[PDB]
RNA sequence: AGGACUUUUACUUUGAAAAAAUUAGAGUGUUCAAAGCAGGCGUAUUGCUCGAAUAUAUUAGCAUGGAAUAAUAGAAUAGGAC
RNA sequence: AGGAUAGUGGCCUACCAUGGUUUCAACGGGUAACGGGGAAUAAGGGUUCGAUUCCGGAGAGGGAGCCUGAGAAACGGCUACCACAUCCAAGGAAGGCAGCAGGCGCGCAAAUUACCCAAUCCUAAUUCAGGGAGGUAGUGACAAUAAAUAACGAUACAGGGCCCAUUCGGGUCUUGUAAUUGGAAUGAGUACAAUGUAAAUACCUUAACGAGGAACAAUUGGAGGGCAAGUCUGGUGCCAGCAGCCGCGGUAAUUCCAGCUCCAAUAGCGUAUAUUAAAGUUGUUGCAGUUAAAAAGCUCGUAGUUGAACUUUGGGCCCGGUUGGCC
C-alpha cells in the first residue's frame, strides 16, 4: 500500500515507542565520529501476522519487533540505539557475498531509465543481492547463486522495472599496457607540417602505480618530499621525479607523462595541450580504445615552430595522441 | 556542447581547506539593543575622515 | 474587572430561564450527562435501521442461533 | 464563512533599497527615539502619507466646501489631541510639513524618557516593556503607546511593580531570605 | 496630426490598432498564447520535482573557462527533456543519479544564466533534504 | 385637466437609483495597533444618554434645468405658417 | 391557427411568405474563462487579477429520465446506460466525500477520521429535539498588529568644553572600552488558586520557583560595480566555483572557499515564478517612422474617421443670497 515498507529488527535492550527518538548506528557509524548517524522520529510501531500486521505502540528488551517509517533514512541493515556512547554491534557475516553476474538493458531504449529504478528497487527487495555499474556502461547484477539471481531477474522482469530486458554476461575491460620499452624515438608533428615531438614509453612499477591508487604518489604532492619517498623507497630518478607532468586518465590515472628536454626554450607553451591530449590518449588506446595502466612517457626532444600561433592547442593535441 | 565532462575533481576546494573553527566571540546585542551598539559607535564615537569619509578598513 | 451580573427576582425564576451551564457551573443541579457525541450519533443510526421496538427481530436473531 | 477580519499593512518600505542619505538620518532616529525597526519609522511615514494625501485631495477642493471643512478640521483637531501637530498651526499646512521626528516625538517611549523616569532614553523602553507606567491606571508594556497630552500628566509608575508601591521584586525577597540565611539563627 | 486619429467617435478604431501593436510586445505574447502551459518545461508552474538521469559535465561559453556540472532530467509531470544545473562546490558528491529533485529558473524567463549553454533550470532539493543541509552538514542524505 | 398635436438626439447640471463587507473616511484610549463598533458617565445601593456618520457608489438606465456645442429639420411646379 | 406550457413565444406542430445575421467583425476557433461585488499596484491615465469568507449562476463519477411536492431534473431520492468500484457461503446485493474529517493517488502545493450545540441561525408539530451548517480546540510562518534577547551604576582609563599651566598639572563637563565588579529591574517560561468555557489549554489574573555569557544566545543574506558595506588573512591557481547583467580565478583574486571584521533587513531574509510600477520598453493622456525598428510603387475609392462660415447677439431696470472693511 502507497509504496512504504516497515523495517524488520530484534530488540536487544529497551522498550519501543510510537514516535520515539533513536539514533541509527549504520555499518560504518562509530561512536567517536558522526558518519552513518541518523537520530530520527519513528511514525509508529507494528506486530507481525504472517503476511499482514497490527499497530502495537510498545515492546520490551530481547523480544523481536517491527519499526515502521524509518525506511527512507537507514542503510538497508543497521543498528538503532538512542544511547549515543553505544559502540557498533557486530556487522553480520553471511559467508556468501556477490559471485553471480549479468548485464541489463531494454528491447525499447526510450523507457530505459524506468529499468534503472527497477534495479534500485531490487536492492530494496532482497538482503545479499548487490546491483552496480560496470566500467563499460552496463548495469552489472550479482548475487548468491544462478537461480537466486534469476528469481531476482524475474523480480526486475515482471514487478520492479516491469518492461522488456536484454541479459548478457558482464562485458569486461582489460587495461591496455606495455611489456617492453619504445624500441626507438617516435617522431610526429602538426598536420600543418612544422613543430615535431619526440618520446619513448616504459613499464612503471605497480609498487608505485598502486602507490598512485593508495595516496603515496598524488598528481599534486611534494616534488621535493615525494622525491625522497620515490628515490630512497621506489628507486626512480629524483630529476624527472620533480619533472612529473600529468596523471592520465581522469587526472589521477595509473599512467604518467615526464619532462626530459633541454634546448627547448618554449616547452611550457604547449603543456596544457600535452596534458589534455595525453588524456584523450590514455582514454582510448590504439589496440582497442581501452584505458591504460602502468604506462609512462619520456618526452625526449620536442621542436616547436617559431611563434605559438602554429604551436597551439588546435593542432598540437592531434600530434601528441599520434606520437603516443 | 561537451556532455561527458570529467567530474573526479569536483569539490576540490571544500575538501582540503585548512579546517579553522570559529574563535570564542562574545555574544552581541540582538534587536533594539543592536541599534544601540551601532548608533553609539557609528555616530556618538564616530571614525576617520581621510579626504571625505571611510568605514571598515584593514591592517596597515 | 468588567463582568456581567444577573439578579433574578427569585431563585425559582433562576432554574426557569438561567441556562444550565451557568447554574450547573455553580452547583445548583447535579452533573447531568449522556454518552459522548460519537457514541450518541453511532447509537442514533443503529436505532434508525431497526423498525419499531422489534424485540421479536432480536428474538429472530435468537432463531438463526439454534437453526 | 464567518466574516473578513480586514487586514492592511501600517508601514511601507522605500522605492529604493540602499540610498546612503536616507539610512544615516534614520539610524540617528533610533538613538534619539531608541527604536529598532525601520518598519517602526516606515509605519510612521505611511500613516504620515495617508494623512498628507487626504490632506492634499481635500486641500484641492473648492474652499468653503462642507468636505474640506468636515474631513479637514475634524482631522487636524485629532493630530492635535495627540500633541504632534502645533496648536498655533491649525491650517493642516504644518501637517503637510511635519516630519517623522514630530510624529515620533509623541510616542510613549520619547515622553517616558523626557518625563525623567527611566533616566536614559533606552532605559525608558526597558521599563515600559517590563510592565510599568499607566494611563488612568491602564498599565501598558507598549513603548509605542502614542502619548496624546490629555494623558501626559497621568504618566507614572502604575500601582504594579516597585517605584510605585506594591510588592518589590522576587530577587529582593530572595535577597532578604539570602541575607537572613547567611547570618541568623 | 501625426498618427493616432484624435477623434471622439473612433474608440474601437484606436482599440483594434492598440490590441494589434500589443502583439509586438514580448511578455504580452507569452500570456495571450500560454507559451508556458505548452512549451516551457515548467508549463505554467514555478518549481517541479523529477528524477536525475545523467550527471552531465556542461562546458562554459566565452570568455570564461571551466566545466559547470549540470544534470539532464526527465520531469515527473511531463518527462520532457530539461538539461538542468546544480549550485555550490561539489554537491555531486552527495547528489547521485536517479535521485528525487526540485528545480526552478534563473530569473531569466527562459534564457541561460550566462556562461552555461542553454541550461534553463537549476536544483534546490534532492531526496527531500536540500543542498544547504548537506552543504553545511546539518544532516546526511537518507536511504533515498 | 376629460382634450388637441408638439424637432430630435448627443453634450452638460443636481438629485435620485442601489446589498452589504471591503475603499477613502467620522468618532471612540481594543494596555497600543491591523481591529473592533464599542462606550462614556450616575445614588456604581434598582439609570441617563451619544452612537454604529457622509461620500466614490464610476457604464447604461431615470427625473429637472441649460440651449453654448456636434449635429438635426423646416416653405420651391408652394407638400406653406396665421 | 393550434398544440404543449404555470404563463408569453418556432417552446413545439401544421400551412404560408423569403427572408433574418454580416467589415459598428456575425459565424467559427482558443480561453492556462463562472460572472458581479470586488483584490494587487498606485501621480494622474492605465495595467493585471477576481476558484476563494458575499451575491446571482452551474454540477454532484459521465449522462439522460422521473416519482413526490409549492418547490427538485435533488442524487448525504430513485430508475437505465456508460465508467467504475466493494460484499459473498456465489443465487444475489449495495455504493458515490466538487458536504466534515480522513486514506491513496495526483502533485510545487494544501490541516485532526479531537470537542460541542453555549454562541449564530435554520428546520420541525416547534422554549425542552436536532444540526461534522455553524461554534471551539488541534496543525499552521498564506497575509496582518504589538515586541522580549537586558538597563542604570561603575573601576582602570585616553578623547572633546572649560575657570588653570615654567612643564613637573591636578582634576574639571563626561564619551566609551573595560576579562575587578554591584545590585534592583524581568516576560519567555513553570506552577496553588481563581478567571475564561458548553468543558478545558491558551489571551487577561496572580502566590510560590524562574537571567548573570556555560545564559533563557536570532537569524537569513551580502561586502568590485550596479547596490550600503574589506583590495585584510589562510588554501585555491580560467580547476573548483561564484557570477540576478557587466563581469571575477590562468600562484600576491577588494568578486572562489573558509578566518576575521563588517554591512542591508529583522522574526524575518534569501529563492523561484507570476503580475504592476519602472515602461514615455505600449502611448486618449504620452512614443517612434530621413539614417536608429518602421510612410503602402502610384493614384482612385469604400466602410470608417472627419469636415468653412451664417440663425436675438447686444443694451436697460430692479431685486433676493455671501465675502470684506466698516459706522
UniProtKB/Swiss-Prot annotation, chain B:
Pfam families: Ribosomal_S30. One of its GO terms (biological process) is cytoplasmic translation. The keyword Cytoplasm applies. Keywords: Cytoplasm, Phosphoprotein, Ribonucleoprotein, Ribosomal protein. One of its GO terms (molecular function) is structural constituent of ribosome. Its main location: cytoplasm. The modification Phosphoserine is found at residue 15. The modification Phosphothreonine is found at residue 47. One of its GO terms (cellular component) is cytosolic small ribosomal subunit. InterPro entries: Ribosomal_eS30. Residues 1-34 are annotated as: Disordered. It comes from the Eukaryota. It is found in: Cytoplasm. Coiled coil: none annotated. Component of the small ribosomal subunit (SSU). Mature yeast ribosomes consist of a small (40S) and a large (60S) subunit. The 40S small subunit contains 1 molecule of ribosomal RNA (18S rRNA) and 33 different proteins (encoded by 57 genes). The large 60S subunit contains 3 rRNA molecules (25S, 5.8S and 5S rRNA) and 46 different proteins (encoded by 81 genes). Belongs to the eukaryotic ribosomal protein eS30 family. Present with 37600 molecules/cell in log phase SD medium. Component of the ribosome, a large ribonucleoprotein complex responsible for the synthesis of proteins in the cell. The small ribosomal subunit (SSU) binds messenger RNAs (mRNAs) and translates the encoded message by selecting cognate aminoacyl-transfer RNA (tRNA) molecules. The large subunit (LSU) contains the ribosomal catalytic site termed the peptidyl transferase center (PTC), which catalyzes the formation of peptide bonds, thereby polymerizing the amino acids delivered by tRNAs into a polypeptide chain. This is Small ribosomal subunit protein eS30A.
UniProtKB/Swiss-Prot annotation, chain C:
Keywords: Acetylation, Cytoplasm, Isopeptide bond, Phosphoprotein, Ribonucleoprotein, Ribosomal protein, Ubl conjugation. One of its GO terms (molecular function) is structural constituent of ribosome. It is found in: Cytoplasm. Residues 34-67 are annotated as: Disordered. GO terms for cellular component: cytosol; cytosolic small ribosomal subunit; mitochondrion. Residues 37-47, 56-67 have a biased composition (Basic residues). GO terms for biological process: cytoplasmic translation; maturation of SSU-rRNA from tricistronic rRNA transcript (SSU-rRNA, 5.8S rRNA, LSU-rRNA). It comes from the Eukaryota. N-terminally acetylated by acetyltransferase NatA. Also partially acetylated by NatC. Component of the small ribosomal subunit (SSU). Mature yeast ribosomes consist of a small (40S) and a large (60S) subunit. The 40S small subunit contains 1 molecule of ribosomal RNA (18S rRNA) and 33 different proteins (encoded by 57 genes). The large 60S subunit contains 3 rRNA molecules (25S, 5.8S and 5S rRNA) and 46 different proteins (encoded by 81 genes). Belongs to the eukaryotic ribosomal protein eS24 family. There are 2 genes for eS24 in yeast. This is Small ribosomal subunit protein eS24A.
Curated annotation (Swiss-Prot), chain D:
Present with 106000 molecules/cell in log phase SD medium. There are 2 genes for uS4 in yeast. Residues 106-180 form the S4 RNA-binding domain. It is found in: Cytoplasm; Nucleus, Nucleolus. One of its GO terms (biological process) is maturation of SSU-rRNA from tricistronic rRNA transcript (SSU-rRNA, 5.8S rRNA, LSU-rRNA). GO terms for cellular component: 90S preribosome; cytoplasm; cytosol; cytosolic small ribosomal subunit; nucleolus; nucleoplasm; small-subunit processome. There is a cross-link at residue 179 (Glycyl lysine isopeptide (Lys-Gly) (interchain with G-Cter in ubiquitin)). Transmembrane segments: none annotated. The keyword Ribonucleoprotein applies. It holds the Pfam family S4. Residues 159-185 are annotated as: Disordered. Component of the small ribosomal subunit (SSU). Mature yeast ribosomes consist of a small (40S) and a large (60S) subunit. The 40S small subunit contains 1 molecule of ribosomal RNA (18S rRNA) and 33 different proteins (encoded by 57 genes). The large 60S subunit contains 3 rRNA molecules (25S, 5.8S and 5S rRNA) and 46 different proteins (encoded by 81 genes). Interacts with snoRNA U3. uS11 interacts with MPP10. Component of the ribosomal small subunit (SSU) processome composed of at least 40 protein subunits and snoRNA U3. One of its GO terms (molecular function) is rRNA binding. Disulfide bonds: none annotated. NCBIfam families: PRK04051.1, uS4_arch. The gene is RPS9A. It comes from the Eukaryota. InterPro entries: Ribosomal_uS4, Ribosomal_uS4_CS, Ribosomal_uS4_euk/arc, Ribosomal_uS4_N, S4_RNA-bd, S4_RNA-bd_sf. This is Small ribosomal subunit protein uS4A. Keywords: Cytoplasm, Isopeptide bond, Nucleus, Phosphoprotein, Ribonucleoprotein, Ribosomal protein, Ribosome biogenesis, RNA-binding, rRNA processing, rRNA-binding, Ubl conjugation. The modification Phosphoserine is found at residue 183.
From Swiss-Prot, chain E:
One of its GO terms (cellular component) is cytosol. Keywords: Cytoplasm, Hydroxylation, Isopeptide bond, Ribonucleoprotein, Ribosomal protein, Ubl conjugation. Its main location: cytoplasm. GO terms for biological process: maintenance of translational fidelity; maturation of SSU-rRNA from tricistronic rRNA transcript (SSU-rRNA, 5.8S rRNA, LSU-rRNA); regulation of translational fidelity; translation. The modification 3,4-dihydroxyproline is found at residue 63. Belongs to the universal ribosomal protein uS12 family. Component of the small ribosomal subunit (SSU). Mature yeast ribosomes consist of a small (40S) and a large (60S) subunit. The 40S small subunit contains 1 molecule of ribosomal RNA (18S rRNA) and 33 different proteins (encoded by 57 genes). The large 60S subunit contains 3 rRNA molecules (25S, 5.8S and 5S rRNA) and 46 different proteins (encoded by 81 genes). This is Small ribosomal subunit protein uS12A. It comes from Saccharomyces cerevisiae (strain ATCC 204508 / S288c).
Amino acid at each position: 500500500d502507497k509504496g512504504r515498507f516497515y523495517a524488520f529488527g530484534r530488540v536487544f535492550a529497551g522498550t519501543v515507542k510510537s514516535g520515539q527518538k533513536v539514533r541509527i548506528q549504520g555499518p560504518n557509524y562509530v561512536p567517536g565520529k558522526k558518519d552513518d548517524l541518523f537520530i530520527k522520529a519513528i511514525q509508529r510501531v507494528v506486530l507481525m501476522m504472517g503476511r499482514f500486521v497490527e499497530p502495537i505502540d510498545d515492546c520490551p528488551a530481547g523480544n523481536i519487533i517491527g519499526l515502521v517509517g524509518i525506511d527512507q533514512f537507514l542503510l538497508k541493515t543497521g543498528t538503532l540505539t538512542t544511547s549515543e556512547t553505544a559502540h557498533n554491534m557486530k556487522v553480520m557475516k553471511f559467508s556468501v557475498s556477490p559471485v553471480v553476474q549479468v548485464a541489463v538493458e531494454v528491447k525499447n531504449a526510450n523507457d530505459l531509465p524506468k529499468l534503472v529504478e527497477g534495479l534500485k528497487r531490487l536492492s530494496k527487495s532482497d538482503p545479499c543481492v548487490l546491483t552496480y555499474m560496470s566500467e563499460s556502461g552496463e548495469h552489472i547484477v550479482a548475487g548468491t547463486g544462478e537461480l537466486h539471481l534469476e528469481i531476482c531477474l524475474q523480480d526486475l522482469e515482471h514487478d520492479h522495472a516491469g518492461v522488456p530486458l536484454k541479459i548478457s554476461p558482464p562485458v569486461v575491460a582489460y587495461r591496455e599496457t606495455v611489456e617492453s620499452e619504445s624500441s626507438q624515438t617516435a617522431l610526429s608533428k602538426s598536420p600543418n607540417k612544422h613543430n615535431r615531438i619526440y618520446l619513448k614509453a616504459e613499464p612503471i612499477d605497480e609498487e608505485v602505480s598502486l602507490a598512485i591508487e593508495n595516496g603515496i604518489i598524488n598528481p599534486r604532492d611534494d616534488f621535493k618530499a615525494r622525491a625522497r619517498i620515490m628515490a630512497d623507497d621506489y628507486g626512480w630518478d629524483v630529476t624527472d621525479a620533480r619533472k612529473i607532468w600529468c596523471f592520465g586518465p581522469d587526472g589521477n590515472g595509473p599512467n604518467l607523462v615526464i619532462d626530459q628536454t633541454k634546448a627547448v626554450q618554449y616547452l611550457h607553451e604547449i603543456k596544457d595541450s600535452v596534458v589534455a591530449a595525453f588524456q584523450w590518449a590514455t582514454k582510448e588506446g590504439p589496440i582497442f580504445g581501452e584505458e591504460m595502466r602502468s604506462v609512462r612517457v619520456n618526452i625526449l626532444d620536442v621542436t616547436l615552430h617559431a611563434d605559438a600561433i602554429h604551436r597551439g592547442g588546435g593542432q598540437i593535441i592531434p600530434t601528441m595522441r599520434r606520437a603516443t | 556542447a561537451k556532455v561527458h565532462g570529467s567530474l573526479a575533481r569536483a569539490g576540490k576546494v571544500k575538501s582540503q581547506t585548512p579546517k579553522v573553527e570559529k574563535t570564542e566571540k562574545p555574544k552581541k546585542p540582538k534587536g533594539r539593543a543592536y541599534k544601540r551598539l551601532l548608533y553609539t559607535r557609528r555616530f556618538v564615537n564616530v571614525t576617520l575622515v581621510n579626504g571625505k569619509r571611510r568605514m571598515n578598513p584593514g591592517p596597515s | 474587572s468588567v463582568g456581567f451580573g444577573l439578579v433574578y427576582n427569585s431563585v425559582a425564576e433562576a432554574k426557569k430561564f438561567e441556562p444550565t451551564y451557568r447554574l450547573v457551573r455553580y452547583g445548583l443541579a447535579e452533573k447531568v450527562e449522556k454518552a459522548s457525541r460519537q457514541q450518541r450519533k453511532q447509537k442514533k443510526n443503529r436505532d434508525k435501521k431497526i423498525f419499531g421496538t422489534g424485540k421479536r427481530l432480536a428474538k429472530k436473531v435468537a432463531r438463526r442461533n439454534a437453526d | 464563512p464567518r466574516a473578513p477580519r480586514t487586514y492592511s499593512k501600517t508601514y511601507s518600505t522605500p522605492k529604493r533599497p540602499y540610498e546612503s542619505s536616507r539610512l544615516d538620518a534614520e539610524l540617528k532616529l533610533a538613538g534619539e527615539f531608541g527604536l529598532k525597526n525601520k518598519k517602526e519609522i516606515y509605519r510612521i511615514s505611511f500613516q504620515l502619507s495617508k494623512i498628507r494625501r487626504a490632506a492634499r485631495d481635500l486641500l484641492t477642493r473648492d474652499e468653503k466646501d462642507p468636505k474640506r471643512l468636515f474631513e479637514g478640521n475634524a482631522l487636524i483637531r485629532r493630530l492635535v489631541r495627540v500633541g504632534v501637530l502645533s496648536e498655533d498651526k491649525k491650517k493642516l499646512d504644518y501637517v503637510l510639513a511635519l516630519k517623522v521626528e514630530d510624529f515620533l516625538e509623541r510616542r510613549l517611549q520619547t515622553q517616558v524618557y523626557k518625563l525623567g523616569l527611566a533616566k536614559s532614553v533606552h532605559h525608558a523602553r526597558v521599563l515600559i516593556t517590563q510592565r510599568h507606567i499607566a494611563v488612568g491606571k491602564q498599565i501598558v508594556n507598549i513603548p509605542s503607546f502614542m502619548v496624546r497630552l490629555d494623558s501626559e500628566k497621568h504618566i507614572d509608575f502604575a500601582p504594579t511593580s516597585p517605584f510605585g508601591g506594591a510588592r518589590p521584586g522576587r530577587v529582593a525577597r530572595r535577597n532578604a531570605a539570602r541575607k537572613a540565611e547567611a547570618s541568623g539563627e | 496630426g501625426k498618427g493616432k486619429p484624435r477623434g471622439l467617435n473612433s474608440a474601437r478604431k484606436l482599440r483594434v490598432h492598440r490590441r494589434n501593436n500589443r502583439w509586438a510586445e514580448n511578455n504580452y505574447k507569452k500570456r495571450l498564447l500560454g507559451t508556458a502551459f505548452k512549451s516551457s518545461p515548467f508549463g505554467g508552474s514555478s518549481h517541479a520535482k523529477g528524477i536525475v538521469l545523467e550527471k552531465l559535465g556542461i562546458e562554459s561559453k566565452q570568455p570564461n573557462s571551466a566545466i559547470r556540472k549540470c544534470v539532464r532530467v526527465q520531469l515527473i509531470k511531463n518527462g520532457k527533456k530539461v538539461t538542468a544545473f546544480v549550485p555550490n562546490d561539489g554537491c555531486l558528491n552527495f547528489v547521485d543519479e536517479n535521485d528525487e529533485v526540485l528545480l526552478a529558473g534563473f530569473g531569466r524567463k527562459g534564457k541561460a544564466k550566462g556562461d552555461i549553454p542553454g541550461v534553463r533550470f537549476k536544483v534546490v532539493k534532492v531526496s527531500g533534504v536540500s543542498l544547504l543541509a548537506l552543504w553545511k552538514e546539518k544532516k546526511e542524505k537518507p536511504r533515498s
